[PDB]
Amino acid sequence: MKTRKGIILAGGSGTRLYPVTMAVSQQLLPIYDKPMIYYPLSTLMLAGIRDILIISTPQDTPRFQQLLGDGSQWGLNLQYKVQPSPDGLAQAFIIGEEFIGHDDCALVLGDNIFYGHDLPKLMEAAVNKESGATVFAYHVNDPERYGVVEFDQAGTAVSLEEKPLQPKSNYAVTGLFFYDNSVVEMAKNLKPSARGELEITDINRIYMEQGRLSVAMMGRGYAWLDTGTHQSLIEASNFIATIEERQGLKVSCPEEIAFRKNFINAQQVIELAGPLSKNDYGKYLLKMV
Amino acid sequence: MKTRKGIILAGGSGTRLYPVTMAVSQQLLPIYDKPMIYYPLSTLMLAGIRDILIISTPQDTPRFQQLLGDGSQWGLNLQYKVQPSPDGLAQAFIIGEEFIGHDDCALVLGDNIFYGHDLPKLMEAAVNKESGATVFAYHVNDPERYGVVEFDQAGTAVSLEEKPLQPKSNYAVTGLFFYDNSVVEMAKNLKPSARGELEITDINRIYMEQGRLSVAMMGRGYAWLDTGTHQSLIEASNFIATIEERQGLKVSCPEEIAFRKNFINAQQVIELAGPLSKNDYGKYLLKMV
Amino acid sequence: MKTRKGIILAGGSGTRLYPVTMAVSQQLLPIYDKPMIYYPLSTLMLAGIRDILIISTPQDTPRFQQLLGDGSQWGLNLQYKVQPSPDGLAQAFIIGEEFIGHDDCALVLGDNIFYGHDLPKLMEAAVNKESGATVFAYHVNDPERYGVVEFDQAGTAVSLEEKPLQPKSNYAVTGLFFYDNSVVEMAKNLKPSARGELEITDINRIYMEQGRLSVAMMGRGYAWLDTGTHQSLIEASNFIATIEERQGLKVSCPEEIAFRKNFINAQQVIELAGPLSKNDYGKYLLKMV
Amino acid sequence: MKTRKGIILAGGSGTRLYPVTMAVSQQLLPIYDKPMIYYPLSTLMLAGIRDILIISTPQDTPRFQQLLGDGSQWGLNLQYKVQPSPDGLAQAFIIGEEFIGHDDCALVLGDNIFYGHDLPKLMEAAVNKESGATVFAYHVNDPERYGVVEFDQAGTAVSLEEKPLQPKSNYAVTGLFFYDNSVVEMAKNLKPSARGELEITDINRIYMEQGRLSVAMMGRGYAWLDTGTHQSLIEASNFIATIEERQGLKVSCPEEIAFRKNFINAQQVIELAGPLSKNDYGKYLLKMV
Ligand SMILES: O=c1ccn([C@@H]2O[C@H](COP(=O)(O)OP(=O)(O)O[C@H]3O[C@H](CO)[C@@H](O)[C@H](O)[C@H]3O)[C@@H](O)[C@H]2O)c(=O)[nH]1
Ligand SMILES: O=c1ccn([C@@H]2O[C@H](COP(=O)(O)OP(=O)(O)O[C@H]3O[C@H](CO)[C@@H](O)[C@H](O)[C@H]3O)[C@@H](O)[C@H]2O)c(=O)[nH]1
Ligand SMILES: O=c1ccn([C@@H]2O[C@H](COP(=O)(O)OP(=O)(O)O[C@H]3O[C@H](CO)[C@@H](O)[C@H](O)[C@H]3O)[C@@H](O)[C@H]2O)c(=O)[nH]1
Ligand SMILES: O=c1ccn([C@@H]2O[C@H](COP(=O)(O)OP(=O)(O)O[C@H]3O[C@H](CO)[C@@H](O)[C@H](O)[C@H]3O)[C@@H](O)[C@H]2O)c(=O)[nH]1
């Protein structure tokens, strides 16, 4: 089956970004011209995923809802589920078991920002994988900061270590994940780690250990914009701004993606743009049609 | 009577920034490493003002209160009041009458950032004017946008015009305002302008027609950033970040303002830094004391 | 045949970038960590092209030689020709006639900065195209600044206009081109245009009339860093930096490409890195091997 | 007497910035919209100094002359001398001994960028000091790297140390020194230090041990950018860029300084602007008069 459901893990308090996030949820902070959640949500839309569950902290969930709704406007089917406390990625599958049912499900952090060429192609194998899982590896300067995927001499992936003190490779596990229906049970049988969290790395290690973990390599031609500090945040906004302004196009603009992927027709775009004739975002949607 | 009372009109829908303001108050968005509101708040602090009224919309008013509280943490006394609808900056005095009372009151916009080493020396005067009011003019390329103030060959002021179609100067009146008790009654008498608003410029002009209006100039060392559009929003954040990383310091840091001005002591700083100690913002305060 | 000859047109007085280009030539301006010319050269290399002809101004040409030499160090055959005057892009073929010979040759401007995933596959068709020519279309915000390609209802490129007043599309022709042997005589027969230049558009036109012009589409996932203004040079620099500093990888590092594509081996890397062992770039090299 | 002479030391192999400096002198590199050297040179001009000697490497000195000429175009008197090898700052005076004669002379490093409104007012005292020296201190989190000056509980130049392992304070001595005429004789007497050089901190000690050393403190309203590495260079570049487009003013623009201090008139400005008009640099000056 084609992975047609996804979950956006937009929780966390964002203590890392205080006092900024103290006022507004990180996934809501604007990345140049749109709230962060738009980027990873766009990534799901690029994979053909319409049925998406957005999980946010009890405080922010109503906020996101205010911004996206049932996503009906963009041919999407948005649903919301609250996560009482940030206890690890893997819990997203528990927090949304009922949502997944017996279908394959992709997962993506709400602060996972991607930019690059064949993004859909890149996710194609992951979206069409019958059983198993797919994670995406990216070359970073600070491997220890992420889950590192080790590589032998042949090439394929042979292991996965979460924030190792001595990374076996410079490739990190990005915030985009794809699992089959079996992730739910894994998550439910998973035990917390030292930092008391249900580590997605444990779930990935389980797939790999069964020879069912595909690691999609992401070359230096793709950009995985970090959003862990105030610095990276502006560098991310400028990056995206640099690209959009030069292109006259937007990156990760859900309305457009919805429109170009035929989730909504031209009339639908106008109805959405109509009220927003002020800001440039509206004029952009209008011009796009 | 030193002006010991200031009002921050941080309301309005700020739609010009959609969708980054759909579920987030414009005044809550960040400027690099802190929320926007943090800036105009520090501005009043630098003026020695500690009794501040935070005006805003019913939806957003409680939010700032959530992030800011009463201000006691920063030796301040924050008070909030709701504005049923954006009827003009001047309504800030009608809505904050009980607040002002008989005392001189300052009004600073919740979305206006003010940078400038000597900016404090400059306000000190405004806070010491016995009667009348004081405005701060800044040289901008888009005079037509803001409010403009004309100056004779003697450098003195002569006329004020709200968004002149044909500007008589490049010096626009920033959202920093220092008034005396006569302002409250001035607002009450004001009639709705063309755009059905109580223009703050009508107040200012009145003082001028009475020679009770000073105009502090913001030389080549000042900076009055805009925050109406996405570009200006990131542009402003880029400024703060740049200057903050280079000149080694924090711009409009309420904590630093509080400690540096004896509003709070060293110990109280280390206490505020804690929830903030995962990034520079907090680690800075820790190193300051 | 496979296009194995390249011409990097790094001429120009750079008047537009004064006084920056008054001191150093544009193509030598640093794009963060390496000189500009290094990016296009890297593009040619990634295309497999090792025999290159650098065409620069009488004044700058030598600066490039001191910088690159015969290129033998990177397994490249770098030759130099002097363009007395910027008579046009097409002139790059007249100056490199003897260089081109009966072989196909690619053209790349010294300020053409390309970044994105799969740069080689994007150019593969061009490299192997038996005959004809291949250019690239990229959606930009200011088409009138470039040669605009027009597409019919089916989406097939059918027209090409140079800096038109009313762009028939938003897709501009990039600074990377691939032509067959017939480009030389084609160019040698071009007459000056309004701006008295041997327009590369005319050349491409000829190929298109004949149906020998492939217009490869360069998607929004690639970045075509602008280098027209000081503002775009710094953004281009920031862009490149945000990518490198995140992956711990360099974008457009000749030594690396040379080493990766086997143009040179590990030992040669040591020798090339030897003298620079006292600097970041040199460390990047050693760390590579 | 007022210090009317100054030396801009602009030598060095620049190997730190390879390969951007391989074919370009570091001091010729751009800092956003103008050549680096335009900064230190602007510092001197703001200090009233008009007669300046530019010392560079034998190969590089020419490129500076080709760029600045005799400097008469800006009302300056530019003279050039050569430094066969980088034996130290102090050597500048042995080189420029014939240029200095019997007058006080200032020194500025070619690659030093100073920013600050009060900068002129500050240097004023340095130029008017009857005898002695005037160094400039700035707060740097990386003292060990530079020359560090010590301040007793009172706040004076109690101790000077060149790149001390154990910084005796976080105040570094910038690259702008104002000496009296006795410095020349000091230089010629200095002896090679550990790194076989003629240390400037040594010459500075002499003045200190004579109670003749003044220390101009550069508060937080100042910014002394670094340009030693690729990262620093781009940072320094984002700095200037942001303050100009934000504050609407060019930073360290010789033409403007020349016109502001009446070294040149508007007629000359327009003529200078001509070649530079193809961009804001020209337009600015044209608009400035
Ligand atoms: O219960 C939770 C846990 C996390 N988060 C959010 O998830 C995002 C993930 O960021 P972060 O917490 O810093 O990721 P880590 O937990 O440090 O690591 C996981 O996410 C990384 C993605 O960069 C992977 O590299 C690692 O292998 C994986 O273990 C953040 O915005 C978090 O607030 C939630 O919303 N709820
Ligand atoms: O009742 C109101 C009206 C406005 N605003 C806020 O004020 C900010 C300023 O923007 P805007 O309302 O469009 O400014 P203007 O009201 O058009 O102009 C006023 O504010 C300018 C400063 O930008 C001054 O230059 C002008 O002289 C002054 O008349 C915004 O975030 C608004 O939401 C409120 O909070 N409440
Ligand atoms: O009068 C001139 C002409 C060219 N050059 C040099 O030649 C190269 C060309 O740059 P530029 O003048 O800006 O390109 P255009 O001539 O305006 O346009 C050509 O290059 C564009 C971008 O690659 C294409 O879109 C167009 O179709 C093609 O005609 C550069 O290195 C320039 O410095 C000059 O210095 N002066
Ligand atoms: O004979 C020489 C020595 C240096 N330089 C140049 O001076 C600049 C300054 O950098 P560097 O040589 O590394 O400065 P240091 O020698 O490390 O230190 C000196 O310059 C510092 C400011 O950067 C001061 O704080 C110190 O007290 C002073 O001793 C560079 O572009 C050098 O190439 C020359 O041109 N000629």
Resolution in A: 2.8
Query: Which of C18, C29, C233, C250 is best to mutate for the D interface (most D CBs within 10 A)?
Result: C18
d(CA B116, CA B255): 18
- Give D273 to chain C, closest Cα distance, Å: 10
The runs of H, that is alpha helices, within chain C are 20-23, 38-46, 61-68, 91-94, 97-100, 119-128, 183-188, 200-209, 230-247, 254-260, 266-273, 280-288
Q: Is residue B235 part of an annotated ligand binding site?
A: no
Angle among Cα A34, A37, A38 to the nearest 5 degrees reads 50
Q: Which residues of C touch D284 (CB under 8 A)?
A: none
* Highest CATH level, class, for A1-289: alpha beta
CB pairs under 8 A between A and B: 104
Strands A133-139 and A171-179: antiparallel
d(CA D237, CA C205): 41
Give the helix/strand (H/E) hosting D256. helix D254-260
Q: What token pair was written down for A241? A: 């701004």
Q: How many CB atoms lie within 10 A of CB B62?
A: 12
- Nearest residue, CB atoms, A20 vs list B23, B30, B230: B30
Q: What token pair was written down for B225? A: 């950033």
Cβ–Cβ below 8 Å for D245 and B235 = yes
Helix-then-strand count for chain B, H and E: 11, 11
CA C281 – ligand 2 centroid, Å: 50
DSSP bridge partners of B137: B173, B217
Give the helix/strand (H/E) hosting D53. strand D51-56
Give the list of residues 6+ apart from residue B285 with CB closer than 8 angstroms, or none. Answer: B253, B255, B256, B259, B269, B270, B272, B273, B276
Residue D234, phi then psi, degrees to nearest 5: -75, -35
Q: Which residues of A touch B35 (CB under 8 A)?
A: 19-20, 22-24
Residues in chain A, how many?
Answer: 289
CB B202 within 8 A of CB B190: yes
Q: In angstroms, how far is the first alpha carbon of chain A from the final one?
A: 33
Write out residues with Cβ below 6 Å of ligand 3.
C 9, 11-14, 26, 86, 89, 109-111, 146-147, 162, 172-175, 197, 199-201
| DSSP 8-class letter at D35 | B
Give the list of residues 6+ apart from residue B106 with CB closer than 8 angstroms, or none. Answer: B3, B5, B6, B7, B44, B47, B49, B126, B127, B176, B177, B178, B179
**Nearest-Cα residue of chain D relative to residue B249:** D220
Strands A105-109 and A171-179: antiparallel
d(CA D142, CA B99): 48
d(CA D16, CA D24): 12
**C-alpha dihedral, A145 to A147 to A150 to A156, nearest 10°:** -130
Nearest alpha carbon, ligand 2 atom 17? B146
A35 lines ligand 1 (CB under 6 A): no
- The ligand 3 atom at the shortest distance from the C-alpha of residue C195 is 1
d(CA A3, CA A6): 8
Cβ–Cβ below 8 Å for B22 and A33 = no
CB D201 within 8 A of CB D173: yes
d(CA B38, CA A124): 45
Cβ–Cβ below 8 Å for A35 and B17 = no
Nearest alpha carbon, ligand 4 atom 3? D88
A87 lines ligand 1 (CB under 6 A): yes
A11 lines ligand 1 (CB under 6 A): yes
Q: Which residues of D touch B238 (CB under 8 A)?
A: 238, 242
Q: Would you give the distance in Å from CA B158 to the centre of its chain? A: 24
DSSP bridge partners of C105: C5, C179
Exp. method: X-ray
Cβ–Cβ below 8 Å for C247 and A115 = no
CB D289 within 8 A of CB D259: yes
- Give A190 to chain C, closest Cα distance, Å: 31
CA C99 – ligand 3 centroid, Å: 22
CB pairs under 8 A between B and D: 55
Nearest alpha carbon, ligand 3 atom 21? C146
Sign of the Cα torsion B89, B90, B91, B97 reads: positive
Strands B213-217 and B133-139: parallel
To test ligand 1's pocket by mutation, which of A109, A144, A161, A206 has the most ligand atoms within 8 angstroms of CB?
Answer: A109
**Domain limits of chain B?**
1-289
Tell me which residues of chain D have a C-beta less than 8 Å from any C-beta of chain B. 116-118, 139-141, 219-223, 225, 235-236, 238-239, 242-243, 245-249
| DSSP 8-class letter at A185 | H
Judged on CB neighbours under 10 Å (0-12, 13-18, 19+), A86 is middle
Q: How far is CA A70 from CA A48, A64, A73, A76, in A?
A: 17, 10, 8, 7
Q: Which residues of C touch A219 (CB under 8 A)?
A: 117-118
Helix-then-strand count for chain C, H and E: 12, 14
Longest dimension (CA), chain D: 54
Q: Whose CA is closest to C18, among D272, D289, D236, D281?
A: D281
Residue B206 DSSP SS3: helix
Q: Which residues of C does the annotation place in the binding site for UDP-alpha-D-glucose?
A: 11, 27, 83, 88, 111, 147, 162-163, 173, 195
**Which stretches does DSSP call E strand in B21-91?**
51-56, 77-82
**Which stretches does DSSP call E strand in C83-194?**
105-109, 113-115, 133-139, 147-151, 157-162, 171-173, 176-179
A96 lines ligand 1 (CB under 6 A): no
